[PDB]
Amino acid sequence: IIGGEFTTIENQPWFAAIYRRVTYVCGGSLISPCWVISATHCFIDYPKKEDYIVYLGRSRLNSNTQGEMKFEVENLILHKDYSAAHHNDIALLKIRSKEGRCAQPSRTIQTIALPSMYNDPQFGTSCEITGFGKEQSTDYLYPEQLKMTVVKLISHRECQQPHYYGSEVTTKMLCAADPQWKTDSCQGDSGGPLVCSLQGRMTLTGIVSWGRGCALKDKPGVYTRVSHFLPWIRSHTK
Numbered sequence: 001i002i003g004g005e006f007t008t009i010e011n012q013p014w015f016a017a018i019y020r021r022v023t024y025v026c027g028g029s030l031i032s033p034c035w036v037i038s039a040t041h042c043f044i045d046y047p048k049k050e051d052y053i054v055y056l057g058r059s060r061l062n063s064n065t066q067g068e069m070k071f072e073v074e075n076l077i078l079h080k081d082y083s084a085a086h087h088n089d090i091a092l093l094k095i096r097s098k099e100g101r102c103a104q105p106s107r108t109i110q111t112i113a114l115p116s117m118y119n120d121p122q123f124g125t126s127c128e129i130t131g132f133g134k135e136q137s138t139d140y141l142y143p144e145q146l147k148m149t150v151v152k153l154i155s156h157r158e159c160q161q162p163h164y165y166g167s168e169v170t171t172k173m174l175c176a177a178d179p180q181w182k183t184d185s186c187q188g189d190s191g192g193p194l195v196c197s198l199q200g201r202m203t204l205t206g207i208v209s210w211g212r213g214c215a216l217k218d219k220p221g222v223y224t225r226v227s228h229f230l231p232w233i234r235s236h237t238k
């Protein structure tokens with residue numbers, strides 16, 4: 001996350017940290033006790049379950065947070081109509097601990113609700129993104145602390161402009177950005193939550209998916225339009 005501020009898991013009790021062996025991979029969003037939704041592109045190269053470690057209630061990248069839970073990946077469901085721009089960038093991780101249980105709601109652990117089907121906030125709305133991604137594009141390292149910021153929804157017409165992202169953007173993706181392009185998601189923030197308060201309720205509007213650079217003029221971050229995948233989400237979590 002470029003710019004923004006630092007935070008703790010208490011401000012995104014649903015955000016998940018996914019590792020692999022052990023290095024960070026991507027973020028995730030706990031949408032229910034046993035289910036974490038993230039982005040496919042994050043796992044396509046090592047599509048195997050046995051390698052992933054998921055954490056909930058974790059506020060730091062390489063040190064523990066009092067109260068976090070560690071989970072294995074019972075199942076790694078990747079969308080079948082993927083290419084990557086990146087299409088159907090949506091993944092589902094079934095989580096189970098060595099004790100066999102799913103996630104237990106706590107002060108630093110809670111689930112996030114999905115939107116009403118095909119229902120998205122109007123463009124210009126302020127949503128918040130969360131993650132352990134670079135603070136700057138030249139950084140080699142990722143921040144040790146969890147960060148977050150706010151970005152506004154860009155209409156599909158604006159993001160389609162050849163001088164924006166052209167045809168690469170589809171009705172199934174949302175664009176979001178800072179009017180001055182100073183804050184934004186960056187490498188390391190993929191999969192995680194694009195939360196907007198809609199209808200007066202916090203909802204998972206998108207999943208950090210892709211973008212040309214980080215905080216560059218006319219180059220919004222792109223997010224998987226969650227509201228266009230509920231039957232997929234519903235069927236695959238059954």
Ligand SMILES: CCOC(=O)c1ccc2nc(N)sc2c1
Pocket residue numbers: 185186187188189190208209210211212213214220221222
């Ligand atoms: C995880 C792969 O890292 C990137 O290369 C990368 C680059 C730009 C970008 N903009 C976003 N909203 S997510 C993102 C990821």
